[PDB]
């Protein structure tokens, strides 16, 4: 019944350590991609990544961070930023059964799972493992590690859905508001960056391998010579809030979440059907009586995926397609964190009135023809934006956000 | 404002490879716990587990199983059973936008995360890793590995929340029905059994270590001499269905889900709070006009955890305790699979009119004074049942199920 608005955001990304830095990078078309000695050293073919360039040392209390893997660190810092941005005091949001947290990762912590197993296999066994690995390694680490220190009393769990993870978190947070169960839900995600997980993607041929000598050019969504995604890590968090509760406190409102699509392909494991995506966008658009001014695509820089989505975009919009850009060409693919980060990039475009460029397009793919792939930063007043997240395993999420 | 019912179930557990074996084990008070040479060989102090005693070879299509860790296999088989049980034709549930899947795991696949890094570090590098590790290892593996082969078109994602995982999966399925978004949601979870994960629990001292010589006595929820939980693996699935839809097709209805609590402790990371559990049970009982006849407790056989739950149950029910038993004393703790397996034990009790026994109690904990802990199989006409899932990391779920 109830309407859901976004009233604060926070982010730790390859393109910036807070919303000010991210906004600057988006406007500049600045790449967050760097060469990775770690990835090269591990024997991988992809030697490039979207790393967080924040030194996180000392930023979280000792007794809190001892439970945390990097996904949780990134998500925690993002949540601290979001609470500050929202203007929420602990009096208001802590020990409050109407305030929840839904935040996940795509992978958990392969680094800590592998650490556990390596230590256990040495001469010291359990003593080498130590008593902290479960919270770091479990799939719910990002929710568990944040709900305790922020004193959350409402919903507390992690949704995971690969590349759609934190979009489904945001949509479920919206569902909690619509059901009348929560006044606020912090929604987002985090993802560590590590050879332990990255090598799994390289093994399936998913990562870019031909551009290691020019890291900033490797991620190139829609380019005719794209060769796979560039893996990234980071975090993000948004404050999803019931509309009346927000107005009553004088909240700063970014946008209303006016649409949330969530579908399944029920077809292929590793490649999109397009059919799932068409349904997901239409669901997100249902009852949305204003056109989409800007679409932040899923667009990971993969030969098949990039154009399946564009095909889906055509079928949905017909002869009224929106301006489109793929911010992953700058940021890389942060997996479980992508949905919330890209919702944030879309909210920054909406708030500050511009479209970020789809960079590194030297030759546009023929299946992009007739669509407005925006390749230069363009100032424009936007009203309604859409953001797609199409995960491995055929799971789809689309969010539509609109000025109030 | 739509109502949700369970119309089918499926289960692979330490106490039965199907609901008949499960029902029989429940009535008999039969332990599923065995000695594990794998655990011992790994260097652990805990050498007991709730293993799935089922040779799964050739049970799943070669091109479907190749994407799967054990959690997915167990969930897949459970979902096959649940579909048969619900009387669902391929034409009824497949390729249908109003039919979804919400199913998760506590840990994903520690074994395949570790396998990936091990393979990467050896002589074949990426070729050893192979192209199937992401779908085995990622947090959403269980939902991804099932949505494709079962041709699911509606919602598709995983929830993780440790011990509460598949209970939140079921609650979220209910929400999908309440919002009018889905007609059927398959809801459940799976968990592999492996030293790779088990040793992390042992390293924090959570697992039973004193009863290795008598495996069946190890899991002893509420017993004065309990000394930790017994890890288990397995799977479960329920068919969550909108009331009218179920009636319209002449479905067999086990029960209505009349309450669903989901709360967070927001307190001490390590210990269960007590209060979060009180708030969770009260949330699940809100508006329910009938007494709780039977409560399947969370109780994992840990010194602190068991007493916190006892104390919470006494706060909620005062001097009017329901009949209570901890089926984990028979089954061990299947982590991500627990919520749905225990919802199923609960539904089988409501269906077959009996209370399963709380086994291995030689001396009842004193914190259990004033409660009705049932330690012998008891025939009784139940109408309303409750199942608690109080997850590591302070994340709570409770489900209340009632005859129509
Ligand atoms: Cl500005
Ligand atoms: Cl019978």
Curated annotation (Swiss-Prot), chains A, B:
Name assigned to this protein: 3-oxoacyl-[acyl-carrier-protein] synthase 1
Oxidoreductase found in the keyword field: no
Function: Involved in the type II fatty acid elongation cycle. Catalyzes the elongation of a wide range of acyl-ACP by the addition of two carbons from malonyl-ACP to an acyl acceptor. Can also use unsaturated fatty acids. Catalyzes a key reaction in unsaturated fatty acid (UFA) synthesis, the elongation of the cis-3-decenoyl-ACP produced by FabA. Has an absolute requirement for an ACP substrate as the acyl donor, and no activity is detected when both substrates are based on CoA.
SUPFAM superfamilies cross-referenced by the UniProt entry: Thiolase-like
GO cellular component terms given for this protein: cytosol
Similarity field: Belongs to the thiolase-like superfamily. Beta-ketoacyl-ACP synthases family.
Stretches assigned to the Ketosynthase family 3 (KS3) domain: 1-403
Induction annotation: Mainly activated by FadR, but minor repression is also conferred by FabR.
Superkingdom field: Bacteria
Disulphide-bonded residues: none
Self-association and partners: Homodimer.
Active site residues of this protein: 163 (for beta-ketoacyl synthase activity), 298 (for beta-ketoacyl synthase activity), 333 (for beta-ketoacyl synthase activity)
InterPro entries linked to this entry: Beta-ketoacyl_synthase, Ketoacyl_synth_AS, Ketoacyl_synth_C, Ketoacyl_synth_N, PKS_Beta-ketoAc_synthase_dom, Thiolase-like
Substrates-to-products reaction catalysed: a fatty acyl-[ACP] + malonyl-[ACP] + H(+) = a 3-oxoacyl-[ACP] + holo-[ACP] + CO2; (3Z)-decenoyl-[ACP] + malonyl-[ACP] + H(+) = 3-oxo-(5Z)-dodecenoyl-[ACP] + holo-[ACP] + CO2; hexanoyl-[ACP] + malonyl-[ACP] + H(+) = 3-oxooctanoyl-[ACP] + holo-[ACP] + CO2; octanoyl-[ACP] + malonyl-[ACP] + H(+) = 3-oxodecanoyl-[ACP] + holo-[ACP] + CO2
Subcellular localization(s) per the UniProt record: Cytoplasm
